[PDB]
Symmetry: none
Subunit: 327 residues, 6 copies
């Protein structure tokens, strides 16, 4: 990568050759697009998979559900060409991109809700692999292929990680986790356009030694890096965080029109709650036992949430908005 870039402070301009890790969540251009292996090959894979007894697939990335929705009509036309008694529908997914326990062997509900006629316990998932990139400036494709065997680790050809001076980052096409040092290394921001379930490979992780699986702010089950940069002092793993929203924004600030204070006689740690009631009233009193300020805050689409270690003070959690993931 040969080019120039101004520093974060904006007082120097440096040119040379190296590795340039670019934010792909804020693309500055058109979003990437996946390309299938072959039109007929995917049809044969679907045929022999449904012969093997699978009722569809689950998308691992939000850039693959788009491809499936694009090519479902052509695939169904190819199916009807051979007189096959099978139908494929490309649904939509909002929230966590749930994990399927099956795969797609090389040579039928796609995505959608938690249908009881096709449980996730036998639906294919995480069977693609990048093999080429291409060219272009305002638009670039991605050519995908099949995976040879079982793997629950996210594809590493779309990921990145870098550190320089006092600022690290763990980036892929749907995640952007930022870290910085102010007397200690801790996470400061995290922009999530999707919620995955595959594992972050340890070959693309900084500071991967001596990490407890309970200290990671982003849980290991939600493609959180196995790093000590994925850590905030005074908090624990947000297993029951508002991960059902889909798009999230992890920030350490204050939700508008609300105050948080530190009290020793506070409630314990449990499911996360929203700063608004079931009807639309605003709660303005919260407290934590041992948290550090500013408090953890998930800026969702429907409102503004807090972490698992923060509890309301002028409201009762019996009648509030509470996270729906393993409550």
């Amino acid at each position: 990568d040969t080019g120039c870039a101004v520093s974060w402070s904006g007082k120097e301009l440096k040119c040379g050759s190296g590795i340039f890790v670019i934010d792909n969540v804020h693309t500055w251009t058109e979003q990437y697009k996946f390309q299938p292996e072959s039109p007929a090959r995917l049809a044969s894979a679907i045929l022999n998979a449904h012969e093997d007894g699978v009722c569809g697939i689950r998308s691992t990335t939000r850039l693959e559900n788009i491809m499936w929705k694009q090519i479902t009509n052509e695939l169904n036309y190819v199916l009807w060409e051979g007189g096959h008694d099978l139908t494929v529908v490309a649904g939509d997914v909002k929230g966590v991109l749930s994990k399927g326990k099956r795969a797609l062997a090389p040579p039928f509900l796609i995505d959608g809700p938690d249908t009881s006629e096709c449980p996730n316990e036998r639906r294919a998932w995480n069977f693609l692999e990048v093999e080429d990139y291409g060219f272009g400036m305002f638009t670039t494709n991605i050519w995908m292929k099949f995976r040879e065997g079982s793997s629950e680790v996210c594809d590493h050809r779309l990921m990145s990680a870098a550190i320089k001076d006092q600022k690290a980052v763990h980036a892929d096409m749907g995640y952007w986790i930022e870290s910085s040092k102010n007397q200690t290394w801790q996470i400061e921001k995290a922009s999530l356009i999707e919620v995955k379930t595959c594992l972050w490979p340890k070959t693309h992780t900084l500071w991967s030694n001596g990490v407890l699986e309970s200290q990671m702010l982003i849980p290991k089950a939600y493609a959180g890096p196995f790093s000590q940069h994925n850590y905030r002092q005074g908090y624990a793993t947000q297993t029951v965080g508002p991960w059902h929203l889909g798009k999230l924004e992890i920030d350490f600030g204050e939700c508008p029109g609300t105050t948080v204070t530190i009290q020793e006689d506070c409630d314990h740690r449990g499911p996360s709650l929203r700063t608004t009631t079931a009807s639309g009233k605003l709660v303005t009193q919260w407290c934590c036992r041992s948290c550090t300020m500013p408090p953890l805050r998930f800026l969702g689409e429907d409102g503004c949430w807090y972490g698992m270690e923060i509890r309301p003070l002028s409201e009762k959690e019996e009648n509030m908005v509470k996270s729906q993931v393993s409550a």
Copy 2:
């Protein structure tokens, strides 16, 4: 770091925001210049250390030596204005940058050849740290300051690391260690302008878990990353390599006129040997027990060196140039 950069393939020009890790071991111009604090503090500290029982300092990087040789005259002038009987001699660096055992506290031969009159056990080392960065495009300055404590770890504000697709790198002002994926994550090349002895911080290290201190080609003693990218198949730690040459260019290949054949029977592991004898005869046949081709190849001021596994089968060790470092 906002800017634009052309990709490795050269068919794509991508612009955006992120982190740009640039090669300083190979930059168009001298990009950085260490700048001291003041001629007063750096004279009172030197004097107080002199009555404290030290006889000099060892430089940690090859820019600190230039910094000392650029202000030794001002230090002498200030000290002589202070009315004392102390003289600082700003020497040079010969090969490896050995470490001292003392330090300078914030409120006299410097560098030079190893002299028993002023041993390393009575000498300071690694007492400076980065305070801020400067402005500019070609002649940026870096500001130094004293360390409150003591540490064997290198300064983390001068180091970097990045990974994208299948390409890793660990970089600082004098190191450029590249890695790549070809059926395995293993080292590809290295370019060492200097040879340090501090420890690479684990906050700037990719893939830091499950690492044994016997597989890293660059030893932990000589500031080699504690990473699994610092690895090559069939080799081990190069503790008796040509680290006395200073500048080095590690690469995998074959020097002209030579040939390596792998045979368990080959001589066991031993110190590295140059490809030319003292007279200048070109040895044209080597062997290794369990290495892997292409073989390890150190290139410096002496032309060609091989690793600790590539032994000569058509030559004896009676007249061979061997590594200066002893075990």
Copy 3:
């Protein structure tokens, strides 16, 4: 601003930090995009304005009309799903951006809507309810400018990117007639000045005297240029500004040309304009003391289509003031026709 540039003469390349004032009229890229607050806030504000008696909205910038046009459908959908009797109609801007006399107050106790962003699956509400909130359009009598809202938005931050960048707007806390200062700029260096804006680009230079030389106007505003963004704004007479103060002209002495006065009755009814000093194709102007006084601006092509060749001014300076538009070529108030019977020529529609 950190970057590099090549000087006006083209023989130097300087890199550093400072302020870079870029021509946004000739953008080199795609235009900026105004992004409003939220479907719930705007719908509540419009509903409360209609309750108060506000009849409509007059746009302040040509970039705001596009935002209103793109959000009108979502506003109508929200106003219908809320169970209200109101429909929003967005027109088009033709000519001068007229000035309203009212404003929208910030909304309290906002309405209810699903998302926070703009753009989702919706339905087309029927054009009905017998109560319309007109946005822009022609000058009518059922909805006069005395009951229309004007200049009630302001920037709260900028976006990111190089080709397409978004600008996020909010509500003004008070009421003012001054243009928003977060979209304006001005610079001077050596012997060249500029007063920039999103739709204004006034150029000035020194040739034995500081005076205006060029002006590109892709819109005709009616707010006031803030004096914090004005160069050389002391001892300024309102009768000498080439661009009138009532059309967002800078209150500066760089907005001046020798021999000319304020162009109050110029061809401002066109919208887009290109002010420059030269000769229209096929015409000539001569200095004559017997020429009559100044009046409304006139076009060099009559209604039928013939060309007027001979012109003369009284005490103007050459080259003459010239306006370029889609209609044709115009002259300033001081240049008068000498050859074609001025009771036979097209004149400016601006009030005399």
Copy 4:
């Protein structure tokens, strides 16, 4: 100025053509070089001035003093080659760049010389004495400032390059107290303004109000800032400008800070300065009504070497105004010491 730049937030990359005002105090490269008229013309002008009664020259900028300390040997050689008694002496700048009251006129009857460029390793003509021409130097009585030449050079054109660039000078056609406008700049955009020249950098910003925030001065001048290069020049009161009008301070309302008045007795004798708002290391300032009136600026350390810890202000606004000089840290004219006593401290060496 065609080029590319990134915004202050670093989130945008905007390319285009306009005016780029770059910092030259922190110039990222080598400084500009001033190139005079010619060895024959300067000698003629100096001889005519000496005949008229001008005893010396007082510089206006540091870049001109560097120019004068580079051509003295060639000027002396040219003077000696004509066969007349005069010796040119070049001094140094120590403090404020004072001002003279005479000037050098464009000389007719040019002297005799063959070369045009400067510098060919000439000989050192021995000082003839009995007649001297002093340039800069300490303030003496033999050649007082009332009989010195000042502000008689101006730019004619810039040079070329990226690192080393030359500026070509020429004699003025008259006498003026205003600084040369071809070395000055000013810009504003969004909520950031700046007034810049070759030795000044006055940055201003908006935070609930427009006021000065920083000022880097590597020289102290005495000419007047031209009002053609000044933003917001109306309604300016000379008693409210932070940087005084007598020290080339802009006649602008951006050159203003709330709670402070003009700093006429500030530490200008130092030369290089750094105006900032904050507390000097180890000191505290409290706003209490029982405080002394204004007075000369004082240093935080006594001449013995003791640091005064407590200071008090009457009606100013925090953070306090603070000057950064070569020797130490200074306060403004409103911050009075209550810990120590004024009479036992170092005050401003400038006259009241």
Copy 5:
């Protein structure tokens, strides 16, 4: 052209002022875009030409075909609103851009209209009435090339921008068979030469001799390369230019190769080409004295898919000349096959 560039070896960086000849064939994204004069003028010219016998237009470059195809709608709008019946159809280009014998003359009068730009006031214009003005298209017989316009436009000036720039075209005053010099380039430095164009990129180099090394054509013109833009244009024989003069080949000694002559019967019917010296995949070429005479170029693969492997040349110098078209890999006129015979293989459509 002030800017910085990295040398050929990539180990350096140089900045300065001069002329930068940039490749417009492999340039990421399209960088230039033709702009016509006006809808009213073009329709008037079309009428005044159809009144004289002209029944179509042949394009000169492939950037003009795009302009014709994107502006052929407002022309029909003007013709339909004028009342006079005439329809314009814009086809595509096949192979070589053939040459016409007519030209559009500038209009004397004009047709009434209300716009000076393109992209407004169109419905469908649903009228043809068998009075067709055919722009480009296939080689028909109703309107032959002997009665069809060609090479009547020239560049007025260039536009502004970084990624896409507009080129403003205007009508020529007189007929000419030479290509427009204002869109061409040529540069030589050290041992590298190039003859650049909007669709041509011809490279030359020295390695013991000055001869062509690599050409890259995305179109095949028929005008003449001007000699003012040609390097080393003396002592040139028309029988030795590798690219023929009739195909806009430079009249230069850099357009030369040892052992080869003019390729008049080469594969010039493929449009895009890549002239190189080497072997098509899976073929061997040798030199034998008993080979037959010269002939048309032949593709390596028969229509059935038979890859001929044995080829020979009588006086050529290896590596052999080859063409890389869309269909397959070709050879030059001097390379005849030892296997098969020129009776059951595809020849070159170009013939006399």
Copy 6:
């Protein structure tokens, strides 16, 4: 080359790959440095040249004189170790770079390197144009060029250091010491020229634009002074300037009026003749000149010692006997 550049009008910023011809007279950096082969080969070559008659050498470019000055000291402390009685004497360049009729050969009572015109070692026994480039250094803040011996005699300048480019309506013929600019204003003709030195070799025709149909009596810069053999080297109304102020060295050819002087077009004037200066020997300015069939603005030569006119512009209100003329071979 690969990079970005802003066009002449300043309205565009085009990036890509191609050939960038850069002005080397106005370098933006420090000038190139010639580097010889080795301190031993040159000594053998000069010794063998002095053996058979060659009494000296003449420089071809201004950059070769610098190299000879830098290397002569090492070349003279190598001539006494072998006992050979020969001491090389360096020198400076003033005026044109005169030609030589000999040439050193690759190696297997004084030597004069440049200087004034001395009958002790005439140009007919002086080597000239025997060095050529082998590779470059082309970058920032420093540049080096490595030279090597030339095989055969040649009167053509070394083509490695030359360039030429044309785009749109502007052409240029560049060099390490030449910068000739052409432009199209209703016709193609020369516009400017910045000769930091005057050479006497021939401009190669491989680096020349529009080389067909060229007359040797119309080239404004003569072909004997390394003028391009092109039709861009032409100005209407003027012929070849065989007798001009070439003895100055540095020149700047431009078209205009020298300060305080006026030139008109009348037919009652003297015919073509040597170029004259605008000031007399005493230093009195002349204000009236006239040309027979020239075109305006008039041809003007700018030197370090004054301002000159072309051969077709003669004075009228003064007598040429009191004027300083060009000191070249008429």
